[PDB]
Amino acid sequence: GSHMGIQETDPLTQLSLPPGFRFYPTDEELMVQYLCRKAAGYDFSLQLIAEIDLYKFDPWVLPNKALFGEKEWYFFSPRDPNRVAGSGYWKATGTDKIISTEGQRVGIKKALVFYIGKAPKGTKTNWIMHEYRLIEPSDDWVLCRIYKKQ
Amino acid sequence: GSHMGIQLTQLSLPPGFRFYPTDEELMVQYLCRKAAGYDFSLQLIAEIDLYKFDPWVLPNKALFGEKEWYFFSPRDRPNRVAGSGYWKATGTDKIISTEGQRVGIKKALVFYIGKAPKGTKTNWIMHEYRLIEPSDDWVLCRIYKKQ
Ligand SMILES: [Au+]
Ligand SMILES: [Au+]
Ligand SMILES: [Au+]
């Protein structure tokens, strides 16, 4: 009959963010305010960053799966070398960083780069992932920042 | 005499959100809206006479900010005195545009301590944004400390 459209929820508009405010979290904030508080069920933590299985997708599709973002995008992905995703694989790079809060260490940040193809014969892309994980024993998520270098 | 007292947190802001406006946003969403007499959900950028203060106490007056601070200051109708020093214009002024139309001018200044022209340079910087006008009267200033 009469038309009834779908009514999406933009999480930034429900926060009433004033113009000019952007999401530029520190590593400590990502660990404590997002990754840790997700486990505790805090509203903003659950509503601002989307859960996805990151390894089902090519990275250039990810910006469209993120709840927001201009040149970087954040996700929670299930916690689990050269892991396959879409048409390629993510390869760990650089030196992992320990993240601390109030003298205590809480998480580890790992950098990865996406290669297109089949390992170890893929070609490097500009797609970068920073994977943040809690230091804890064996729901279970990592928080990932995705961006394109340049 | 029973006691009768005088009465950012109101705002919901989740951790990680920081004020990083583009020049176009400062001109159109802040300075133009204020000049046109529009209301704001909350006042985040307060009015102050910037030239009454040494720049290093300005962070205490700003309603938010960790490393840059923003204010509306009365539009003035070289080396303007403020507190113990003066602000000296530097660099090349920039025209700011929105949708093919020029709307504002950004000017940089640097604070010197002392009496002009014999002061010494500090790391305190101001960016003064003003609306383009014919040849609520405010400028919008960003204050920060270099390094
Ligand atoms: Au936690
Ligand atoms: Au205006
Ligand atoms: Au305002």
Report the gap between the CA of B100 and the closest CA in chain A (Å).
21
- Given an 8 Å threshold on Cβ–Cβ distance, is A24 in contact with B16? yes
Please name the residue that has the structure tokens 């230091």.
A135
**Quick one: three-class SS letters along A18-83?**
CCCEEECCCHHHHHHHHHHHHHHCCHHHHHHCEECCHHHCCHHHHHHHCCCCCCEEEEEEECCCCE
Distances A16 to A10, A11, A108, B41, B71 between C-alpha atoms, Å: 10, 9, 32, 9, 21
The two beta strands, A104-116 and A88-101, are antiparallel
Instruction: Output b/e per residue, B92-111; b: 16+ Cβ within 10 A.
Output: eeeebeeeeeebbbbbbbbb
Technique employed here was X-ray
- Residue of A67, A35, A38, A34 whose CA lies nearest to A50: A67
Write out the two tokens for B108.
């940089």
Tokens standing for residue B147: 């390094």
Nearest CB neighbour to A21, from listed B18, B26, B30: B18
Which value, in Å, is the radius of gyration of the alpha carbons in chain B?
Answer: 17
Residues after which a C–N gap over 2.5 Å breaks chain A: 80, 138
Give the closest ligand to the alpha carbon of residue B35: 2
The distance in angstroms from the start CA to the end CA of chain B is: 52
The residues, ordered by sequence, that sit 6+ positions from B60 with a Cβ below 8 Å of its Cβ are: none
Q: With an 8 Å Cβ cutoff, is B63 touching chain A?
A: no
The gap between the terminal CA atoms of chain A, to the nearest Å, is 50
- Residue to mutate among A14, A21, A29, with most B CBs inside 10 A, is A21
In angstroms, what CA-CA distances link A121 with A90, A149, B33? Answer: 13, 21, 56
Q: What Å resolution does this PDB entry report?
A: 1.9
Q: How far apart are CA A68 and CA A71, in angstroms?
A: 10
Give me the residues paired with residue A129 across strands: A112, A146
Q: CA torsion sign, B110 to B23 to B96 to A150?
A: positive
Q: How far does A68 lie from chain B, in Å, by closest CA?
A: 13
Residue B72, min C-alpha distance to chain A (Å): 16
Residues of B in contact with A21 (CB under 8 A): 13, 17-20
Cα separations in angstroms, B100 against A19, A37, B24, B95, B97: 21, 45, 12, 12, 6
Domains of chain A and CATH, by start: 26-150 (2.170.150.80)
